[PDB]
Assembly symmetry: C3
Homo-oligomer: 244 residues x 3
Amino acid sequence: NAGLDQVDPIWHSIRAEAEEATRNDPVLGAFLYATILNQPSLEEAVMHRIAERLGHPDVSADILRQTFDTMLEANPEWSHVLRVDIQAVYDRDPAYSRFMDPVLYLKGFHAIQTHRLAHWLYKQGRKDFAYYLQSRSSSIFQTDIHPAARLGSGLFLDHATGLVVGETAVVEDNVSILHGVTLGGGDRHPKIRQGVLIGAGAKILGNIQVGQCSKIAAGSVVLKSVPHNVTVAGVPARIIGETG
Amino acid sequence: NAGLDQVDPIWHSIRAEAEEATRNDPVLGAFLYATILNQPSLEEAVMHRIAERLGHPDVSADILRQTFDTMLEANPEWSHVLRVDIQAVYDRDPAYSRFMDPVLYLKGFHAIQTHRLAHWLYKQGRKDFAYYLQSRSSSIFQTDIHPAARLGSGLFLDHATGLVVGETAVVEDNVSILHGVTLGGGDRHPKIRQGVLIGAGAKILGNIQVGQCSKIAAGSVVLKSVPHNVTVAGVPARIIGETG
Amino acid sequence: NAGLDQVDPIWHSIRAEAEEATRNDPVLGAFLYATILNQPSLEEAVMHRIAERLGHPDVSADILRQTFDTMLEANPEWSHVLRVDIQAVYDRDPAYSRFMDPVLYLKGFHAIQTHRLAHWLYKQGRKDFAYYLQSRSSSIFQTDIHPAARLGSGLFLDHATGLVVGETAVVEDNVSILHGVTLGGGDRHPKIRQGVLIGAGAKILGNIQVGQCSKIAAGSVVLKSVPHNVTVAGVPARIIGETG
Ligand SMILES: [Cl-]
Ligand SMILES: [Cl-]
Ligand SMILES: [Cl-]
Ligand SMILES: [Cl-]
């Protein structure tokens, strides 16, 4: 509408990718037009997708979409957060070559933003709506994230199935978390510092911290804080080397 | 209606909690009135919620609700079981401060009672209905519990995602079981004695027993019977201390 | 219709099993007639079930069923593949005594065939339809299988919850894979040779191979190729014995 905001290569690429896909598979036209092409913005596309996935007789897509609208209005920074979350997927995963892929398909990405809505509702004292969302996400996306948990931006929830994040956990920016991960057990759950990779099935338990840029090997059981710039593996986890 | 049965602090608290929540977030009114406030009893509230979550074109909420009614009629003790299952959640989990939370939201609690219905159907020789329920629960609650499995009362299925319970398994009373747990492999699956805690991701395999009050650390692989009043951890599991 | 194809003991047994079940529980009549008895073939029964489970407002059962039809037409060998996949379940699992059980109920079996459809679509350059299916299956069946992955016949996906299979993975024939398994990380994911059993929660990571007839113990973390005819266990996995 005016100024630097008009530069939006991610949205423009997504719109191009949906145009080309509908051309290639016209039966998917209702899907791609309703989710992307008929949308006035990437924000609305992402809200709409997630409201559609979570929508139920119990609480309709429309109500979820209306509430998402209220959250964007109160949290204008969500425009950037969602784009860098998108960017994380694109940069960190060779499996998917389009910006549209996380928006349409990847439940990890849908669960992140669902949590962001739930967290805001929770903070506003709308705790039933926050628990409803937590419950719905746990059932549909298989991600159980307590609404009081704090998630940074550029988070990559890869595959996602089985993720459990406790009430007092904190995840900072540019973290990647695989499927089957527990951030579990006043302050009694983990603090994950920026740039961390958490591998498949890892359990990180207690009020401990995982230092910046560290890697948690698949299947690790982490019961003690991890220094920055190390790789840890094993049950129980031990430092096995350095990393950048 | 008469006598000691009229004392029902859990139901009364739930009804108060739903009244207050609808007041605080009126859009959730359809939900809270249909699930709690319009219900004549806690039994009906819990049946209704679970029938709504599992309801599908294939087999409707109403049919599931009618069958749940038949199960309560045959199994009048379910009134108590469901209340002590509720109580377990309230007592054992700091994350949720209301009795209504497991009833409305927590799939673990929904899966326990779904299993109870499936088990009864199985015993009655209604094995397709029991397998249908098992299948539905596995898909929606991510809990795969064979209908022939036997679950005690006051069970806390915390987070629940990925639970697998085999045909010959037995869980006694006051057990807590986290997400990602396998009770797996004549008698070929585990017997879990009363008061046991099973941590996230543990696999307990074979016709072995876990003694009363014992704890299974997150990520343990248990291939041999565990004595009462010990903590075990590791792959393979070893006793690491005593506990009460 | 003519010749050796008329011999179809699996379909005939299924039809008998559905007739008997509807008799025993008539409320399940809509289900059993729509899924089995009104079907002209086992192929159509399996397509119909899976299209019903995956069907959504976003993309309807009918469209999924029409696309499944196109896949069978192009891939006539699916008739055999689906029967030997059925046979695998029947032979390898004591919990279920009917051929109809995997067809109606077991999400593992539904996810295998969903992948087969997604893979074909992917190869045809219908990558959005393939990703949509992958996404839907991940959400409903809790199986995340990249469409470029290659799965052999007679595969038994037992319990299935949490399965993650990467883009370059290969699974050969007569493999069994439990819940919670990762075949994860050019060629960067595992090659599983024929006759392998992969136990609950195992993670097999990298461009490594698991030799013919080998067993992967529950909870193993496999970072190096495994010889044929051995059992491996532990974090990290070590050979613990021979097997046939
Ligand atoms: Cl935000
Ligand atoms: Cl009962
Ligand atoms: Cl095929
Ligand atoms: Cl899982």
